[PDB]
Write a protein that binds this ligand. Structure first.
Ligand SMILES: *[C@@H]1O[C@H](CO)[C@@H](O)[C@H](O)[C@H]1NC(C)=O
Lengths: 348, 336
């Protein structure tokens, strides 16, 4: 995958002392050693990572050279540092679940549990922080913190079912999502009063999750390369230049954070995918789906704070498929007891 | 060091025989730095047959090398360490060096407890979340907590901010480059304020916390490294991914090495590479041994005054145990 990069470098000079290039090495050790001697981070291309953390080492080396490259084939970026304020446009999993509660805050429910590994911890803490009449989901009852890959996790579904409501939320690896979905049929056949919400990839990798209910440029990376490189274009410093010497230069380019700061400050100056904080983008819009039949119709105008549903609004649960009422009350109750003559007389 | 390694080749190697329950081998940890980090890992893996019992060598003045070490370990399942003199915190998917930010925070709060002070500071926020949250959680006590305001880093704005708090004793942590603005700025550097910074670590360049071996030289560092290696080997007795650089991805950490104490020091770490029940001391520069181990209390200079009055509010007050008006009864634990 290099034609896209070649076009990008061709289009690099659109608005206006070289244009960078890279060679996509599958593994990382040779890519790591070639990162600097090959040539802030003009090229930040993860070619096609078939692994998870493989895009990390070259970015770490660039940070060691003070070059906050922008991650492209990244969806769950556990960087928020171990790296050095690496740039990033595509929002991570951090707020990918946040949008839910606001939607849930106005769409259908008030108190729906949510489910979990570090990415899960970050997501849950961000969600509970986002929520600062009142309401609360798992914070009302509980949130799981489990180990990925734990098959036959039945007590989890069992304890989930016995709570007041059936509305649930989760975000985990593909295998974990599949296992929880399969258990859903077990442990009281979760549904007909339950909900689901996960990252678009989780639905995509969800071979067997029917009742469960996405992206802007993920898996395509087509129309956003241009605006990405354009955003770099204005990075040119006005006031040293970005040094290109790897061997014999053990110090650090003091310019690096100096202009990384303004790179962070830089905003707008683009269109489409273009238009924050540290290595992240504060704006994005996403859709949803209901998983009707075997089709995951990615229908939704969630678009952050502004939601515009349509087109068969929803058939949420696999058992009911009708309008989801939401919160469910309880009938059975457990009651305390203390021994005392006024109103507590106990005999064999 | 350079030729010092040759000396370290003999003594520390001999130190292995000090505690060598049938150690297979521990020849040398050759530096061969060549003054370059780019290919340092290259030759590290090149030298990395017959696996390696483990060699540690790393020392760079002023610690952003850990991620490269982590990647090297992953790419070769290497559990070896490199340095002890320089260290820093990192949470990545081996890495074992003396450092504990939370230990520093708890130690300074302990010192405050027995030194009777009320800390509303903030410096440039490099990883501010960790230290700030640690302070906030430790605020949920019963004695301290009056000073909780926060601050921010970058000159006039900084002067106004630092003058908006005062509150006598204050302490903040940040990088040295950002630290200097403290002396640069409202110039309220009154003697009635002692400051402690954990973030920067390193050393002066007052009172602050440092590692037990901070005063000690590289000899104790190599001794600790070889002791850790021996403990790991003993645990293994109950493969570094072939040490190939040219399974799809190894996955393990601290499989055998759990914890041990040597040289009267608990040379142990958590699964998160955290210094478990470590030993650290405190500095005193106009340094001095001011500061702690075994989860216990250590403090010299048992002072009862505070060098205070930097503002005539504490007045010498005394009397006799009359009884009708002066009650003196035994307190362990705390007073009523
Ligand atoms: C970058 O420089 C090299 C040699 O310095 C040159 O061959 C190459 O064409 C330059 N890049 C572009 C896009 O012109």
């Amino acid at each position: 995958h290099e034609q896209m990069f070649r076009e990008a470098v061709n289009q690099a000079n659109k608005r206006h002392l070289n244009a960078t290039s890279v060679t996509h090495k599958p593994n990382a050790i040779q890519m790591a050693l070639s990162v600097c001697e090959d040539l802030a981070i003009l090229v930040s291309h993860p070619p096609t990572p078939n692994d998870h953390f493989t895009p990390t080492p070259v970015s770490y080396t660039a940070g060691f050279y003070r070059i906050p490259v922008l991650g492209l084939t990244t969806r769950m970026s556990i960087y928020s540092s171990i790296h050095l304020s690496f740039l990033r446009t595509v929002p991570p999993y951090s707020h990918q679940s946040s949008v839910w509660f606001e939607m849930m805050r106005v769409y259908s429910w008030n108190h729906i549990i949510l489910l979990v590994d570090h990415e899960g911890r970050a997501a849950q803490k961000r969600l509970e922080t986002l929520l600062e009449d009142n309401k609360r989901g798992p914070k009302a009852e509980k949130v799981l913190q489990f180990d990925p890959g734990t098959k036959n996790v039945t007590a989890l579904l069992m304890e989930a079912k016995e709570l007041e409501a059936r509305v649930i939320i989760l975000s985990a690896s593909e295998d974990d999502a599949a296992t929880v979905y399969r258990a859903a049929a077990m442990l009281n056949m979760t549904g007909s009063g339950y909900v689901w919400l996960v990252g678009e990839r989780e639905i995509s990798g969800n071979a067997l999750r029917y009742a469960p209910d996405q992206l802007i440029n993920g898996k395509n990376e087509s129309a956003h390369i241009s605006d990405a490189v354009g955003v770099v274009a204005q990075a040119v410093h006005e006031l040293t230049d970005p040094p290109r010497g790897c061997v014999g230069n053990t110090n650090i380019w003091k310019t690096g954070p100096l202009f990384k700061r303004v790179l962070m400050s830089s905003k707008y100056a683009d269109g489409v995918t273009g238009r924050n904080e540290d290595g992240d983008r504060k704006f994005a819009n996403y859709s949803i789906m209901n998983l009707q039949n075997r089709k995951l119709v990615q229908v939704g105008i969630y678009n952050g704070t502004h939601v515009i549903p349509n087109d068969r609004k929803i058939i949420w649960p696999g058992g009911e498929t009708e309008k989801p009422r939401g919160y469910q009350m309880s009938t059975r109750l457990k009651i305390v007891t203390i021994h005392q003559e006024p109103f507590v007389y106990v005999k064999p | 060091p350079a030729y010092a390694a040759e000396a370290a080749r003999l003594g520390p190697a001999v130190a292995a025989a000090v505690r060598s329950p049938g150690l297979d081998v521990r020849p040398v940890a050759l530096v061969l730095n060549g003054s370059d980090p780019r290919s340092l890992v290259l030759q590290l893996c090149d030298l990395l047959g017959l696996r390696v019992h483990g060699v540690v060598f790393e020392d760079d003045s002023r610690p952003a090398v850990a991620p490269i070490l982590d990647f090297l370990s992953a790419q070769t399942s290497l559990p070896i360490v490199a340095v002890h003199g320089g260290a820093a915190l990192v949470l990545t998917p081996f890495l074992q060096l003396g450092s504990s930010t939370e230990q520093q925070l708890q130690v300074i709060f302990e010192v405050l407890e027995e030194y009777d002070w009320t800390v509303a500071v903030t410096t440039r926020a490099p990883g501010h979340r960790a230290f700030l949250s640690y302070i906030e959680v430790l605020t949920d006590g019963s004695l301290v907590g009056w000073e909780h305001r926060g601050a921010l880093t970058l000159e006039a704005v900084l002067s106004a901010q630092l003058r908006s708090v005062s509150a006598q004793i204050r302490l903040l942590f940040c990088a040295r480059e950002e630290a200097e603005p403290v002396f640069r700025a409202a110039g309220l550097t009154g003697s009635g304020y002692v400051w402690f910074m954990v973030g920067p670590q390193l050393a002066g360049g007052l009172f602050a916390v440092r590692s037990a071996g901070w005063r000690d030289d590289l000899a104790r560092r190599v001794a600790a490294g070889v002791a850790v290696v021996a403990r790991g080997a003993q645990a293994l007795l109950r493969p570094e991914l072939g040490h190939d650089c040219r399974t799809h991805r190894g996955e393990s950490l601290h499989r055998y090495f759990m914890n041990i104490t040597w040289d009267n020091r608990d040379y142990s770490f958590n699964e998160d590479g955290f210094l478990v029940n470590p030993s650290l001391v405190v500095i005193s520069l106009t340094w001095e041994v001011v500061g702690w181990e075994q989860q216990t209390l250590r403090l010299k200079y048992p002072l009862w005054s505070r060098y205070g009055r930097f503002l005539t509010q504490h007045l010498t007050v005394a009397t006799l145990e009359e009884r009708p008006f002066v009650i003196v009864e035994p307190a362990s634990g705390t007073c009523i």
